[PDB]
């Protein structure tokens, strides 16, 4: 049943409302108290750190136990991130090595 | 420590990069594959369905019970989420049943 077509496609709704909706909360500069109701507090310190994992994995200059030093993430964690960034649309990839680096 | 000042400190920094990276992101029509990378599936779907509890607690014309019915969300997450809608401030709240009723 979340497995249906139909919650698939009920899903991906729901998403893109939620993308749509933080778009117009950065026009109107309401985008931190709706990121500070939207999400829990791990969520928000989770996404602070993933910002430093990918920064790093890009920089490309340390190993796992000093990111598991600074950052406190587990190799799992920091693979899990790598496999991600490896499915980034380059675009994407381009532009955050220009802003993060 | 995590609760110590400095991690603290920069907890609340590293976040708010989170939030001015996604801001750029938004402006460069970047957002969707940024939050492919940095969120899972599963937080994902859960933002989605963050905004319909949202949506619905505002509405008020669903009881709290029949949400889970419908959403698939336990009492104890729509309790959570109406407790971060009691503190959003005003303009949040004022501005959410604009654009989501
Ligand atoms: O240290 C704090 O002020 C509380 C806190 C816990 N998780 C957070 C994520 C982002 C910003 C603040 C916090
Ligand atoms: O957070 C996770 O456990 C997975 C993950 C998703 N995006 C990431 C970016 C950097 C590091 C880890 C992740
Ligand atoms: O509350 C404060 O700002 C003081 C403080 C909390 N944890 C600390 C760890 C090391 C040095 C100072 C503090
Ligand atoms: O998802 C959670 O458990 C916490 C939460 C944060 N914001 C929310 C909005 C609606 C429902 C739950 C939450």
């Known amino acids: 049943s979340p497995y249906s077509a139909a919650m698939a496609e009920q899903r991906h709704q729901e998403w893109l409302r939620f993308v749509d909706l933080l778009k117009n909360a950065y026009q109107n500069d309401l985008h931190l108290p ?13 996404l ?14 340390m190993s796992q ?4 030093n600074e950052l406190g ?26 802003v993060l680096l």
């Not at 709706?34 to 989770?46: C, G, S, V």
């Open 34 to 46: 709706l990121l500070n109701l939207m999400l829990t507090p791990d969520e928000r310190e989770a």
């Open 48 to 61: 602070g750190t993933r910002v430093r994992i990918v920064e790093e994995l890009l920089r490309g200059e």
């Open 65 to 68: 136990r000093e990111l598991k």
């Open 73 to 98: 993430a587990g190799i799992a964690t920091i693979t899990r991130g790598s496999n991600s960034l490896k499915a980034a649309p380059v675009e994407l990839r381009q532009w955050l090595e220009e």
